[PDB]
Every structure is written in structure tokens, then in C-alpha cells.
């Protein structure tokens, strides 16, 4: 039940991690930076799987792991792409929508929202928006779904519980008078941390706003010794509340117990600012992405399985250079067929149409007299101004009608 440092890696130097997401189907983790470059990593060995620029301008704000591929979220796009980098589909979003929050309701439906006052329900296989739901309080940057309600965190400091079918607002909590940093839902308890506005201005609230889902009311707030920017329920034995401060000071607490300063640990107290955080579904691994692009994994086990049921991850063999027989290029008589050739029955990949397969005489025409006169020899090059009576690489042959 005690998580300690396992490994730390740099997704991108000097470019902050803008969102991170463990893949729930494989022993993978995906890290997207604010600069538009994304990288996946395998296993505790932190090994780089794939790395590429997802979009040139929009920072990455949510990654969703699906059975068939990876969903990347930016400010103005939604990209469903294969694990190896082949693009599955690319749904461009309205530039007028500050796209921030994903929600994988099921294998084919995605709820997308953000600073806009609307949430788009989109079918991925069709690559089409199927529904558009209005929101009376724009600024929904955190989105969660349980078996009972949709949990929407708003930048106004509120948490809205909505019906899972009609999406209509059923319940509301004014967690903070300022802004919301994070909120989490587990079982019969909801924990929210954020900023409130006082006489000194907007500052982080050290009293976690804890609500009992059973009796639908706020319970005594949990005073913490840090500035809680993130909260996450870890149900290892009890619902341990992983309190995360952007300064790096994090804490274990009980959702109804008392905050103990002995439960305070430090991820990166000095230097990097905690920006992104996630917990493995197995509750065995923790990831913190900081402002330098660095991702830190803490594990309560020496060699945990990110998922208890994790399928095999294939690796690509490097080129087997030494196995082939040597052939001298200067030797133009050697039989080239010594190289092994596996056979396939399908039509040859590159076969040519009859019209483009016909040879013909293509005797090049002589030089223009103008070019011959004006051509000055410089070493071995012919320096002659372009006559400008032809096109660039225009056909030197008179095509027959």
C-alpha cells in the first residue's frame, strides 16, 4: 500500500507534459506534451514504443485508450490512430470550441467538451457527431462517468451530477467560489479540491470538499497541509484520497478520517510543477507529469502488472542485415536471385495499365540553335539562360493522337 519511485522518464525536454493516460488494454502509457508531440511507453522498463507529432499547434489535453487504437485530443482536433502510427480517422473540431475533456462512455461513443457551453456526443466508427448537448455552465474541463451519473467539473468551482441518459442537470455542488482544480468520484463519496476567492484573491483551498453520495450532502471538509490541485480515490483497502499539489507535496488521507501530516510525501517539492497525474486501474502504479516533460512512476510493488489481465505486446524485429549473402555491386554478372523470395498469390502490388505499359521510340530532339549559340562552356557545365519557350520538364516527345 506504499508507493515508491520506480522510474522517471523524459517525454520531451523543456516541453511540459500536457496530459498522460495509461492504456487499459496493454502495459502501455501515453504522454502528450503541450507542444504537440506524443510518445507511448511500454512496461516498467519505460521503453519508448512510438513517438510522433500529433498536431503542430494544439496542445494535447486527453488521451483515450480503446481496444482498436488510441484517441488523441488537442485544442481543435480529435485523432483516432493506430498504435503504430497509421491514422484511423481524423475528426476536425470547430475552432470556436476550446476542446478539453474526453469521456469514453463505451467502445464507440465519445463525449467531448471544454470551455465551450456544449458537449458533443460523437460516434467514432462513423466519425460523426451524433448529439449536441447544451451546458448552462461552460467551462467543463473534467469529465467522469460512473454507474449512476455523469460527473462534470466546472472551472467555476462547481460539480454537476447529470442523468446518464438525458444529461439534464440533476444535482449541483458549489464546491468553490473561485475555480475547480480537480474532483474525483468513488463509490459513495466524492472529493473535490480547487481554488476559492478570498480577500487576498483566488487561492487554493486546503479544505477538501467531501460529499457523501449516499445521503447527498457535504460532509466535514478535510483540511490538508498542502495546496490540493488534484484528488484521486485509491480503493486499495479503503478509499485513500491521493491529494496532489502542483508544488509536488502530496498526501494520503481518509475520505471520512482525519488528515495526518505523517501521510505527506513529496513527488517534486523543488523545481518541476505537477501538471498531470493518473493512477493505474490495478492501483499499483502512479504517474506524475511535470512542467518539464518528465513522467514519474511510483509503484507499491516492485514489478506490478499495470493491468491484472494484460495482453501480449508485440515488438518489431530490426533488419537482419548479416543473414543475406554478399553481392558485389561492381560484379554485374552474379546471379541476383540468391536472395530468398517468399511468394504470395495476390496480384503484384505495382502492376501497370495497358496504356502506360506500352514502349515506343523516344529519340531526344537536338539542341535549339538559340541555345547552341548562347551556351557558354564553364568547365563541364553548360550555362545557357532558359529560353522560356517550354514548360519545366515538358515532354520532349510529340505524343501521337
Amino acid at each position: 500500500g506504499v508507493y515508491s519511485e520506480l522510474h522517471s522518464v523524459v517525454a520531451e525536454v523543456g516541453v511540459p507534459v500536457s496530459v498522460s493516460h495509461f492504456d487499459l488494454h496493454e502495459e502501455m502509457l501515453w504522454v502528450g506534451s503541450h507542444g504537440g508531440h506524443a510518445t507511448s511507453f511500454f512496461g516498467p522498463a519505460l521503453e519508448r514504443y512510438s513517438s510522433f507529432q500529433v498536431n503542430g499547434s494544439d496542445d494535447i489535453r486527453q488521451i483515450q485508450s480503446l481496444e482498436n487504437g488510441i484517441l488523441f485530443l488537442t485544442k481543435n482536433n480529435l485523432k483516432y490512430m493506430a498504435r503504430g502510427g497509421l491514422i484511423i480517422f481524423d475528426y476536425l473540431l470547430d475552432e470556436n470550441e476550446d476542446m478539453h475533456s474526453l469521456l469514453l462512455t463505451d467502445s464507440s461513443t465519445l463525449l467531448v467538451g471544454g470551455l465551450q457551453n456544449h458537449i458533443l456526443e460523437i460516434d467514432l466508427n462513423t466519425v460523426q457527431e451524433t448529439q449536441k448537448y447544451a451546458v448552462e455552465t461552460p467551462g467543463v474541463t473534467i469529465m467522469r462517468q460512473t454507474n449512476r451519473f455523469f460527473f462534470c467539473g466546472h472551472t467555476s468551482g462547481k460539480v454537476s451530477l447529470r442523468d446518464l441518459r438525458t444529461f439534464k442537470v440533476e444535482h449541483e455542488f458549489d464546491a468553490f467560489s473561485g475555480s475547480l482544480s480537480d474532483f474525483d468520484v468513488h463509490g459513495n463519496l466524492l472529493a473535490a479540491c480547487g481554488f476559492s476567492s478570498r480577500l487576498t484573491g483566488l487561492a487554493c483551498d486546503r479544505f477538501l470538499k467531501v460529499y457523501d453520495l449516499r445521503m447527498m450532502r457535504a460532509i466535514t471538509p478535510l483540511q490538508v497541509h498542502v495546496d490540493p490541485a488534484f484528488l484521486r480515490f485509491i480503493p486499495t483497502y479503503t478509499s485513500r484520497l491521493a491529494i496532489i499539489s502542483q508544488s509536488g507535496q502530496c498526501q494520503f488521507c481518509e475520505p471520512t478520517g482525519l488528515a495526518n501530516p505523517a501521510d505527506i510525501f513529496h513527488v517534486n517539492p523543488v523545481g518541476p510543477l505537477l501538471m498531470t497525474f493518473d493512477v493505474s486501474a490495478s492501483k499499483q502504479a502512479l504517474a506524475f507529469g511535470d512542467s518539464e516533460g518528465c513522467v514519474h512512476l511510483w509503484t507499491d510493488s516492485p514489478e506490478p502488472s499495470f493491468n491484472p489481465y494484460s495482453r501480449e505486446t508485440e515488438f518489431a524485429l530490426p533488419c537482419l542485415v548479416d543473414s543475406l549473402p554478399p553481392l558485389d555491386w561492381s560484379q554485374d554478372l552474379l546471379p541476383l536471385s540468391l536472395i530468398p523470395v517468399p511468394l504470395t498469390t495476390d496480384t503484384l502490388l505495382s502492376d501497370w495499365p495497358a496504356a502506360n505499359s506500352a514502349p515506343a521510340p523516344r529519340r531526344a530532339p537536338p539542341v535549339d540553335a538559340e541555345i547552341l549559340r548562347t551556351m557558354k562552356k564553364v568547365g563541364f557545365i553548360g550555362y545557357a539562360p532558359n529560353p522560356r519557350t517550354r514548360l519545366r520538364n515538358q515532354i520532349p516527345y510529340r505524343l501521337k493522337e
Binding site: 555491386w329 561492381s330 554485374d332 541476383l336 501497370w352 502506360n356 505499359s357 506500352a358 514502349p359 515506343a360 521510340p361 523516344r362 529519340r363 531526344a364 537536338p366 539542341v367 541555345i371 551556351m375 563541364f380 557545365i381 553548360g382 550555362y383 545557357a384 539562360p385 532558359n386 529560353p387 514548360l391 519545366r392 520538364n393 515538358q394 515532354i395 520532349p396 516527345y397 505524343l399
Partner: protein, 418 residues
């Protein structure tokens, strides 16, 4: 599990015909015993071989090895050449394996021709009482008579080359003749009865009944070619012999009917191969001519493909020369260097557009220009730069020389000779 992997020096045994089930007590109708077919590979000289396994046999007398030696010295084109014979016990029973040299693609007489039951339905399932009117002039299945004459030429040449050695093939049959390609013929299962039905009854003289065997060979050849003519094995039947004769008379040539009469009708003489020769006549030369035409085709195809391979060497050099980051540092790759011209040549090869600028894709320009390049033709070639400033006139010889120098220097650098 019924096929052992390694038998003596042969492995990778793959059954070639649907093998008889182990419960098939019925001995094969063609050979009188249990038969099996496999494809194996020699572990010594690494060659494909076809294995015919016979079941339930032990060597009786060894004298047959002289006959086997005769087959080992017989080398004929249209005969499945017999390589060796040996004894194996890797099978459930002590069996004999015949190893012949292996050819693919063989389709038998029946498989190619007699596979149509309606071709037999002329001889069979007639009206049986309704007035049989005039025979249809175009009997379905009529073969090119040039083709059938070629077939008889090959058959007769095989029989004679066998007989001059003092033996008998005694296996000639529709199912025992394969057609490699379209006309080229191959007779399988040679030198089998010499051991299978090897008895010392003929006073320890295997050649005692050689004349009987050869005359039976002649008779069977006649039956086979009659079946070939009729496209129906019902024709060779004794009760359909007259209908076969009359149909051949109506359709094909007089020399053909006369050959059929000579071969089938017993002439109370040891019939000689030389005897049938004059009746084929000019068709002899006609066949030879057709053969030489096929020759003139194949040699042409060779003359194409080999050259294309030499060209591939070039294109490979082009591929390893264009756009390298090291050539980005190499002054020769730059415009003042020669290799930029190679770049430009690439541009001229692939970037051709019409007078309207639409892309022009055509193999012929490419192939002609590359032939000019590899031949180093004195014909010039004006190369206009990418930035459209200059036009350079260079011979294809100079382009080839610079390109070769580029490739060889690059390969020396890659190998570390530079």
C-alpha cells in the same frame, strides 16, 4: 502419420496422389499391388525426386539389376528418367522405392482430354435403335491434327530409342502419359515390371520375351493413339473399333487411318518403326518448324529479362545516390558538382509533364533514356536545372561516367575503403 519423413537419402516426402486408405485391400488395377506416390528431396545432390512405393515385396532374383542398369543408361527426352531403386523398411512394410528425376506440371491424357464424359458419350449412350443419321462433321473434341501428329512422333521416337537398347517400356497408357507444357510428352513409371514381375521362368533370360513385349508395346501404342484420336477411351474397345475407324476416316487424314491400320491390325510380321515413317511425310518438317518458332520466342524473352536485370543494377545505384544527407555535404552533389546533374536527370526521368503541365507517366521515355544512359550513347541530352536557370548539354556517356564514379565512390566510402 503414414508418411515417414526420411527414407534413405530422401526427406520432405509429400504425397502427390490421393493415397489409398490402409483399409483398401484392393491392389491397384494398373500395377496389381498397393501403390503410393510421394515427392522427396535428395540430401546428397539436393534434387527433387518422385517416389513410387510398392507394398509387400521382397527381392526374388537379383538379375533384374542388369535391366535397371539398362534404364540407368537410357536417356530419352520424352521418358520419365529412372534415377535409382532401393529397399526401405522405414515404412510399416518392407517396400521398394523407385527414384525418378522430377518434373512439375504433368497432366495426363485423361486429365487433359478424356476428362469430358460427353466425348465418350458419342461411343456410349447412343440412341440404341433410333435411326443413326449422318455423323456430325465437327465431332466435339477434335484435336489439331498437327498436335496429334506431333504426339505420334514423340511416341514413336520413344519406342524406337527404347527398342534399340533391347528393352520394352510396357507402361504406355493414357493415365501413364503426362503432358508437360502443352505438347511436350513424358511417359512415367519406367523400369517397374522388370522387378515387380521378375521371374526366372524364361530360363534366367529377361530378353527371352523381348519381342512379345515390344509387339505388345506397338499394340498398346496403337490403342493409345486411337483413344487420342477419338477423345474417348470407349473407342479403343473392340466393339467400338469399327466406329473409331469410321470416324477417323470421316474426319482426319488418310495417312492417319493407314497408320492406325498398320499399328492395330496384326500384320503377321515383327512390325518395325521404320515402316511407319514414310506415311507421316512432310508433317515431320512441319513439327520441326513449329519447334524452332517456339525456340525463337523463348530466346527473345531471355534477351529481354537479362538486360532488365543489368538495368536494375543501375537503378539500385540511383537509389543509393539520391538525396543522402552525406551527399548534402558532398560538393559533387551540389549544383557546381556533377551529381546535381544526376539529380536533374532523375527529375527529367520522373517529373515529365505535358504541354499543359499535367503529369506524364509513361514507361517508354524512362526505358529509352536509361538505355541511352547505360549504353553511354553519344547522343546528347539537355538538362535544364530545377531553378530553371541553365541548360547543360551532356552526352549520355558523360552522364554514365559521372554516375558510375558517384556510385563507386559512395560504395568505397560505405565499405570504408575511403
Amino acid at each position: 502419420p503414414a508418411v515417414p519423413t526420411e527414407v534413405d537419402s530422401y526427406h520432405s516426402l509429400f504425397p502427390l496422389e490421393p493415397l489409398p486408405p490402409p483399409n483398401r485391400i484392393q491392389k491397384s488395377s494398373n500395377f496389381g499391388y498397393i501403390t503410393s506416390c510421394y515427392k522427396a528431396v535428395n540430401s546428397k545432390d539436393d534434387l527433387p525426386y518422385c517416389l513410387r512405393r510398392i507394398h509387400g515385396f521382397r527381392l526374388v532374383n537379383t538379375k533384374c539389376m542388369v535391366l535397371v542398369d539398362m534404364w540407368k543408361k537410357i536417356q530419352h527426352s520424352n521418358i520419365v528418367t529412372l534415377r535409382e531403386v532401393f529397399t526401405t523398411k522405414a515404412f510399416a512394410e518392407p517396400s521398394l522405392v523407385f527414384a525418378y528425376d522430377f518434373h512439375a506440371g504433368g497432366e495426363t491424357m485423361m486429365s487433359r482430354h478424356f476428362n469430358d464424359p460427353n466425348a465418350d458419350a458419342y461411343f456410349t449412350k447412343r440412341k440404341w435403335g433410333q435411326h443413326e443419321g449422318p455423323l456430325p462433321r465437327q465431332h466435339a473434341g477434335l484435336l489439331p491434327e498437327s498436335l496429334i501428329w506431333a504426339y505420334i512422333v514423340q511416341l514413336s521416337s520413344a519406342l524406337r530409342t527404347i527398342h534399340t537398347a533391347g528393352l520394352a517400356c510396357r507402361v504406355m497408357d493414357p493415365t501413364k502419359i503426362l503432358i508437360t507444357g502443352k505438347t511436350r510428352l513424358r511417359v512415367n513409371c519406367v523400369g517397374v515390371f522388370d522387378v515387380l514381375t521378375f521371374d526366372n521362368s524364361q530360363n534366367n533370360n529377361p530378353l527371352a520375351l523381348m519381342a512379345q513385349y515390344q509387339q505388345a508395346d506397338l499394340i498398346s501404342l496403337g490403342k493409345v493413339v486411337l483413344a487420342l484420336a477419338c477423345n474417348s477411351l470407349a473407342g479403343i474397345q473392340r466393339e467400338n473399333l469399327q466406329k473409331a475407324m469410321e470416324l477417323v476416316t470421316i474426319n482426319y487424314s488418310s495417312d492417319l487411318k493407314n497408320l492406325i491400320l498398320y499399328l492395330l491390325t496384326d500384320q503377321n510380321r515383327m512390325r518395325s518403326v521404320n515402316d511407319i515413317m514414310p506415311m507421316i511425310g512432310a508433317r515431320f518438317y512441319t513439327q520441326l518448324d513449329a519447334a524452332q518458332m517456339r525456340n525463337d520466342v523463348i530466346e527473345e524473352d531471355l534477351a529481354k529479362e537479362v538486360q532488365n536485370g543489368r538495368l536494375f543494377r543501375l537503378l539500385a545505384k540511383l537509389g543509393t545516390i539520391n538525396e543522402r544527407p552525406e551527399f548534402q555535404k558532398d560538393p559533387t552533389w551540389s549544383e557546381t558538382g556533377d551529381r546535381y546533374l544526376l539529380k536533374l536527370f532523375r527529375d527529367h526521368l520522373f517529373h515529365q509533364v505535358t504541354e499543359a503541365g499535367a503529369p506524364w507517366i509513361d514507361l517508354s521515355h524512362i526505358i529509352s533514356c536509361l538505355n541511352k544512359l547505360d549504353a553511354g550513347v553519344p547522343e546528347k541530352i539537355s538538362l535544364i536545372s530545377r531553378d530553371e536557370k541553365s541548360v547543360l548539354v551532356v552526352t549520355y556517356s558523360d552522364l554514365k561516367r559521372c554516375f558510375e564514379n558517384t556510385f563507386q565512390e559512395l560504395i568505397a566510402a560505405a565499405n570504408g575503403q575511403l
